Symmetry: C3
Subunit: 113 residues, 3 copies
């Protein structure tokens, strides 16, 4: 799943943003879009560097598809999207990447193990 | 702690839901309910598989009590509650499990180490 | 980043709270305040020990500066702030500490690796 928490207001999140994230992450990770879950949380009380200018804190959790070169590529993609769509400067974005073990991901009454 | 983020609206979360999560997680983990913390976040902007049908993204963090068989059992329990109480299909739920080191959990001005 | 989720209402969060967090975390971790990100989420549906008295579930993610003694010191600091500013008892606070690999933190179109 990909989560974005931001102080940008809800009205500034364009219609279609969750779909675009879904599509671009499917493409970037090489996973079918049926597996991709996205969550956007606007209107947050947040600061970055002490400033309340637009910012984002995000997380990308994946079973595999995480690593040094991949995460550089995801960061370019996702900063690009946040800059274009939400008008958040890339230097005011953090994204934490998490390589999840299949045994530690529940789904459909079981886990992926 | 157990956290559930969902697009299901607040009005659809039944009375008693946090209490029932607390009780059933105490029972499933074998921990006294005094230790259990629960957090439910409805009304979220979320998609799963590109669809906005009811879904959930959840986390369970625990100092121990995490593992292959345990996490399957937690998933059956928790998907069952989400399906019964919130009408979320089990195949539209992800739960990330985290086995926390006691030195990495703060509480009461210190950590559990 | 430091994130606090609480059932305390927004009106009970004092002016200056994000800034005081930012200043005190910079001091505690050594890190320049320009890189510190903070996020406060009030008005949450949460329970701790089955009770809805004020409580908080927090996360602190850092590239390094995490460890047994450091996390104890962060907990004293952060519990003290939550007690003084939000009137939350320290024994109703959990803080999860995460030592992030630089390759798993995206910022400014790249990662910190």
């Amino acid at each position: 799943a990909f989560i974005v928490n931001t102080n940008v207001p809800r009205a500034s999140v364009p219609d279609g943003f969750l779909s675009e994230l879904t599509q671009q992450l499917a493409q970037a990770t090489g996973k079918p879009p049926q597996y991709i879950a996205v969550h956007v949380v606007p209107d947050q009380l947040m600061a970055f560097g002490g400033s309340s200018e637009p910012c984002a804190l995000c997380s990308l959790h994946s079973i595999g598809k995480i690593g040094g070169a991949q995460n550089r590529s995801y960061s370019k993609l996702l900063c690009g999207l946040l800059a274009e769509r939400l008008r958040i400067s890339p230097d005011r974005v953090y994204i934490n990447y998490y390589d999840m073990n299949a045994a530690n991901v529940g789904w459909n009454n079981s886990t992926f193990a």
